[model samples]
Target chain A: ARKVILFIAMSIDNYIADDQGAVDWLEKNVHGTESDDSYEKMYSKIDTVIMGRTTYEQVTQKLSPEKYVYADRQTYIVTSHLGEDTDKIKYWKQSPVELVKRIQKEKGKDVWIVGGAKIIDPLVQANLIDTYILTTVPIFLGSGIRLFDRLEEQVPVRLIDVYQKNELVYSIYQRG
Target chain B: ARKVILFIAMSIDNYIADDQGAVDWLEKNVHGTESDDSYEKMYSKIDTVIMGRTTYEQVTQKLSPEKYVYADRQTYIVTSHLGEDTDKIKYWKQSPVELVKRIQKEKGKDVWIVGGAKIIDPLVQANLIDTYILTTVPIFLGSGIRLFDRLEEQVPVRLIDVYQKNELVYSIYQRG
Candidate 1:
């Protein structure tokens, strides 16, 4: 079975983004720094990426399409509402469990679930997520969408790895 | 006017207490520890305490009457329903704003608003709250009641103080 990892950049206060859905705070804190290399390394290893529509919109709206394109890989947008897609991207409306089974059918490489809270919640609750790579930025945005919004149960996760650079703490979690 | 502070101890994942409104997680994280000093300091400084019925019930159900007497401070229990109160405790059904105005009428002392999210939400929304003392523990209770539920608007808070000990971080925030 292919390993599925959920990669999320969270603020020190546990917020995923500001109230405006702008990850500008993350960019301001993590980008153009030595610490951001971990993000690049993780992004490079994943062959497939999945995210909620809200996250995709927020990313695309802020970043130029040419700069943030998921080239040479399958990008699944999990949305109830249909969305316009470029050739490299695919859309999936399936639940996280069903999507996990479906994604495993593909040949090579691992899957990445990059998200807003909605996408992460279901995946975590379903227990389909294999790993979580969280990059914690030091600055706190006191009010915003949180990283763990819809968790329905207590799920135990063990810290498998830790990395630190530029005062950013990157921690990896997996089910024990 | 009296300064009002809301004190809430939360799991790192944001759960204030468990499904049964049990604070075992909070107790485990806080009790008989150096971190409890933060609470001790807060209790010492605050002359009046206010809590919602649910919060008050949670406290009474978990803690002993002796503990309440030991604290030796005036507590206002806000509820829609009336209940028998001892000499140390008072009951009121006023809105947070009205309650704050009424409290301010007398010689004012620092007031602590212990919470169950609902009470904090209204007091915060009305800007009746003067400070927020959040003791963030390292343990994550994946799902439960949170300290900050549905805040309709952004309330800016400036961090006035922060102390870290034994992986627990205490932050003091005043209205910005």
Candidate 2:
């Protein structure tokens, strides 16, 4: 079975993005941190990503393909309509769980479930999520898009590790 | 000036309580630790408390006169309509900022700005809150009442300290 990992950041108020759906907050609040040690390390282990059109747009607009962060990794966008499949990305119309099971047939070491909430909510409900790397930002928007929304029940998990960097708290959790 | 400190626990979604405004979530998720040394320490520094009617009702229902948590502190519940004031608690119809400023007239230490989001929204808008002692629960309640709601502006804070207790992350922040 292919394990899925969730890595996401949110404002102290739990918003993944501003009311305008812009993620510039994440960039400006990166603090004095310069090195991408964690991502580079995770990238070495994870080869694929799961995201919604919202987040796919974020990456394409902010981290444009010119300086693409995904490199050669596969980024599977969960959407009903297939815009087109590029060398590094593709789209799917199946439910999040169905898509997860289909991809798990492969012998991959790790799957990173990137998100815009709408995409990850169902995958989480279907219990396809294996781990979560949650980062907390310092500012509170008071209102915005939540990273966790529309769930059937409480998802209790174990806290595996915690650390601080660039004035943010990184908490590692695994399904318990 | 009395420094108003916010000490509250919320789910990862920033909800202070479930939709019904119940705090059972906070009770069940304490990680392998027991004791209130930190609260006691903060209590020593805090001489008064400011809370909303919802939180006041919560305290009166669960903690009540028996096993009361704030038996000796000066308690003020922010509300336009005064239901009634106990010998230990009182209500105010004045503007939140006006009430907060009046309280600050007294020379004291930390003023605990306990909340249900409504009262603190204005205090926060007025910049009356001094520090925030925020705790994050391990479980995610997909929906509920947020500790923060509409704010006039973004409240940027600096992370001062962080630690774990009973599987919960407790972070301290001050206005930057």
Candidate 3:
């Protein structure tokens, strides 16, 4: 069976971005300049990517305005508003849990949850995320959009591995 | 000079305690039964302790009802209401930043900011803390009293060391 993974980065204070929704603080005071393979390693395993509407806009407008970053993989924008389904991107109007479960049943590669809060909160509360690859940046953005939000219950995750790459601390976990 | 260190623990979601100020969920999914020497190791370096009024009460009332946990160390309770000072414990009605600066001037082993959000927020924003030893438990308490709150500006911390003991991941950091 394919696994569901959340591969994302946040500050020491658990914020994915600053209060203004800017991720400029992500690389502040990074101690190393070495090449990091953490992202590439995780990207290789996942063929299906999921994100919220805001996150999709953020990526398309700010992060990579030139082109779609996930051109190689199938992307799903889980939003209330419907849109035309393209070969690479699809609009998901139903529950994120339903989409994730349906994806799990397919004979494809692992699923990647590239998130904003809306898409992540539901999947997290539903216990649909199987693997968490959390990258902790060195800076603490005191107030910002949080990576983890209110959960329905206390969910446990066992730490599989943790290491530092270019001053970014990555902690990998499996659902326990 | 002595260092002001925040040696604390939080869930994967960065909550120090549950919504009702309860920490019963801390040990829920711990994988190891072996002894953890993390507390003892850090306690050996600090002789001064600071906490907010609520945390003080929580300790005196629930956590250690029989006795004060920091009997040996000089404890300072940062609060709005003024109170009488004793040999062991003192109540400071002034700014936490002022108290920490005053303490930094004095000769001591180290200062431990034994927290609650109120006492921690000021010291952190003022950049008074010298070391941060964060212990991340395996569970995710979706919402609760956060360990890190709003800051005046972004604070950067450099990772000094990271290790796991008894299913608890500890990340030691210093001012960057």
The runs of at least 3 residues in candidate 2 whose Cα sits more than 4 Å from the true structure, single-residue gaps closed, are A34-36, A65-67, A86-88, B34-36, B65-67, B83-88
Worst 10 residues of 1 chain B by lDDT: B27-36
> Per-residue CA lDDT of candidate 1, range A30-108, in tens?
4334535656777777888888887777666665467666656778888877767778787777775678777788786
Clashing pairs in 3: none
lDDT winner among the candidates? Answer: 3
- Runs of candidate 1 with Cα error greater than 4 angstroms are A1-48, A72-74, A79-94, A98-112, A127-149, A158-176, B25-36, B65-71, B82-87, B104-108, B137-144, B160-171
lDDT of each: 0.70, 0.78, 0.85
Which residue pairs in candidate 1 have backbone atoms (N, alpha carbon, C) closer than 3 angstroms, thus clashing?
Answer: none
Location of the lowest summed lDDT over 10 successive residues in candidate 3 chain B: B27-36
User: What is the DockQ of the complex in model 3?
Assistant: 0.70
Candidate 1 similarity to native, TM-score? 0.70
**Residues B1-65, candidate 1, lDDT per residue (tens digit)?**
67888777777577888877887766565423443576777777778888888877667656755
What are the clash counts of all predictions, listed in order?
0, 2, 0
The DockQ scores of all candidates, in the order shown, are 0.14, 0.61, 0.70
Measured with DockQ on alpha carbons, how good is candidate 1?
Answer: 0.14
